[PDB]
Structure formats: C-alpha cells, structure tokens
Amino acid sequence: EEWLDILGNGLLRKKTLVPGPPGSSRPVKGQVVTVHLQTSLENGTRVQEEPELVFTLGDCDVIQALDLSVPLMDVGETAMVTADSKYCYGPQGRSPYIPPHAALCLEVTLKTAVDGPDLEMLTGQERVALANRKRECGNAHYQRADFVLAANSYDLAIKAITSSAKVDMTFEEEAQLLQLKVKCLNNLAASQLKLDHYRAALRSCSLVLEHQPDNIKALFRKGKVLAQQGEYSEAIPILRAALKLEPSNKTIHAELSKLVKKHAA
Amino acid sequence: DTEMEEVD
C-alpha cells in the first residue's frame, strides 16, 4: 500500500504489491527460503530472473538487500524493494553485469519458508551439497571483492563440514568432505589476506598445509602474509618452496623479488 | 601457470 523505509534512510524501501494469504506468517533467521527474483537497474534494464532462488535467511548467501527485506515479507507475498548499491553489488558490480554503485529494484515473491537443517543431523550427501552451496556463494562474493561476505560463506561452509560428531558417514564421504574443507580454508585464507587479517589468514594457511604440504596457493599466501607482517626470514623459504613447484610462475618471482629488495633496511 | 588470487 505505502513505501516502508526499512532502515530509516531512504536506501532500502519496500512496497507490498500482492499480500500473503490471510493466515501467512513471516520467515525467521535460519529458515531456508525460496523466492522468485526479478532484478532491474534504476533506469529499468533487467539483469536476470531467478524463478526459484534458494537461500538461508541471515546467512548473506546472495546480497544483504534480500536478508534485510525478506524477513519483513509473509510467505506468499510479492513485494517491490528499492535498494542502494551498498546492500547489493557495491562499488564494483558483478558477473551477470551490474554497474559500479548501481541501485537495484528487486521484485521478490516469497514462495516457501522451511525450518533450517540441523547441521548435526545432516547425511554425508547433504553435508557435501550444503558445503558446496556455501562455497559457491563465497566464491561469488570473492569475485566482486566482497571479502567480508566471502569469508562468512566459507566460514559457514566449514561449520557445515565439521559438525558431524553425531552422524555416521562412509570413509569415501569423510575423504570427499576433507577435500572440500581444504578448498574452503584456502578460500578463507585468500579472503582474510585481502582484509589484512594476517593472524587469521596464517591459521587457515597452516591448516591447509597440514593436510596438503605441497599446496602452491597456501604456500604463496602464507609467504605473502609473513612478508607483509615483516617476517622476511620465515617468508623466503616458504615462497621458494612454492617456486620449486612452479619455477616459471611470474607472480611468485615478483613476490620474492619485492620481498628481497624490501629486506634492505 | 597457477593464478594466485583465484578461489577454488
């Protein structure tokens, strides 16, 4: 009927187009919600149409705009949401193209809302599917340079893998999930390093190298972190160990050269 | 050959 100014700043506004059924309720944090999303730019250009977008409320799987506006919708409601770029694809834009600082008009139809899964009660197959979904979310956030959101999705991906103390999985499932955990921890290190969270990036790097001691990405990232911290004595053998695996790699050379030149104070 | 900065 009228525009609701959600955050009190005219940056995230919601207008109900079609209300939900008389008995409908709002979804709560943690619920797996399914929506039909029609995204368009401020000038009216349509971006994409996801007829069955599935995401966990409050987990920031896609964009902040959805996690902030969907809890204000009843299951079965169709609403128009105008959101500023800061709650969307920000000062950088995205892959199915969004211009930098572009305000979005989201036509959302909340379809279903089911209770969130008990991570402790997930099957090996479900655990693989949930962790991979969170990993794919984190990857999408990382490509845009949203390292705070990328780190969160990788953190959720890991939490889903490691909460298996009460379910009996096969050896093949445990091994598959270990391979996924190392990929998520390396991805987390890539994200932490971009946020200068050196102590955290180091932990993630060291955990990856405990499973895979010849992981070139984890070696280079540990070396780059130790170099940016000023631990040149510890960084040079690690950066050399990574060059030993790929001697022609220009990025590892450029990193070593930068480190040795700076090691002159 | 390996792109550092790329995520897996």
Residue numbers in the entry:
A (entry chain F): 91 to 355
B (entry chain A): 702 to 709
Paste lines from the article.
FKBP8 consists of an N-terminal glutamate rich region and a PPIase domain that is connected by a loop to a tetratricopeptide domain (TPR). FKBP8 belongs to the FK506 family of binding proteins, but unlike many members of this family it lacks a constitutive PPIase activity, which instead relies on regulatory control.
Superimposition of FKBP92-380 with FKBP52 shows that the TPR domains are essentially the same consisting of three pairs of anti-parallel helices and a C-terminal α-7 helix. Because these structures share a common peptide polarity, and the hydrophobic methionine and the valine residues of the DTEMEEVD peptide are buried, as expected, in hydrophobic pockets, it is highly likely that this conformation represents the physiologically bound state for Hsp90 peptide. The structure of the FKBP92-380-Hsp90 peptide shows that the C-terminal carboxylate group and the C-terminal aspartate side-chain of the Hsp90 peptide are involved in a series of hydrogen bonds that is reminiscent of the carboxylate clamp seen in the MEEVD-HOP complex. The C-terminal carboxylic acid makes direct hydrogen bonds to the amine nitrogen of Asn 229 and Asn 277 and a salt bridge interaction to one of the amine nitrogen atoms of Arg 225, as well as water mediated interactions to the amine group of Lys 273. The aspartate group of the peptide makes a salt bridge interaction with the amine group of Lys 307 and a series of water mediated interactions with the amide groups of Asn 305, Asn 276 and Arg 311. Finally, the methionine side chain is bound in a hydrophobic pocket lined by Ile 306, Lys 307, Phe 310, Thr 341, Ile 342 and Asn 339.
